[PDB]
Amino acid sequence: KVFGRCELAAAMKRHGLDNYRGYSLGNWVCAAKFESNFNTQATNRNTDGSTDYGILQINSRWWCNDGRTPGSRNLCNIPCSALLSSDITASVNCAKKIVSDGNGMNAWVAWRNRCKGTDVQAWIRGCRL
Ligand code: NA
Numbered sequence: 001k002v003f004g005r006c007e008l009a010a011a012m013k014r015h016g017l018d019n020y021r022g023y024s025l026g027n028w029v030c031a032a033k034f035e036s037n038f039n040t041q042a043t044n045r046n047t048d049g050s051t052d053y054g055i056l057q058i059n060s061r062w063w064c065n066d067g068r069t070p071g072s073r074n075l076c077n078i079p080c081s082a083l084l085s086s087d088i089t090a091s092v093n094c095a096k097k098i099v100s101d102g103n104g105m106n107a108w109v110a111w112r113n114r115c116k117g118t119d120v121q122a123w124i125r126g127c128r129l
Contacts (some may be wrong), residue, residue: 001039004038008032009124013025023099023105025129027111031110034115035052035056036056044057046059050072053066056095058080058098062075064078064082076090
């Protein structure tokens with residue numbers, strides 16, 4: 001599913017991301033846009049053989065199991081497919097673990113290079129939240 005901006009903001013808010021580990025909701029919307037263009041079905045392979053999955057491009061070397069990333073972990077205890085769902089639950093729950101891990105949102109490269117330090121409230125402007 002390809003979310004609207006406002007529609008994903010609202011889903012993220014319902015699943016408890018707003019101000020999660022101190023990251024306001026616009027952070028999370030901005031990272032979804034630049035990671036996946038709001039597309040729950042985005043995948044992208046990496047040079048290391050791992051793949052990034054779903055709306056927040058979560059990586060198979062550490063976080064989910066895809067059966068084709070040797071030696072990798074599965075810290076979110078889930079199949080990487082389960083992150084491509086129209087229901088964002090699994091993606092949020094796993095993102096909460098990632099943002100906990102020490103590096104905050106810097107885990108997400110496109111957050112760091114396209115959202116950090118910018119006017120991220122813009123991403124929720126106009127939204128009935
Ligand atoms: Na894995």
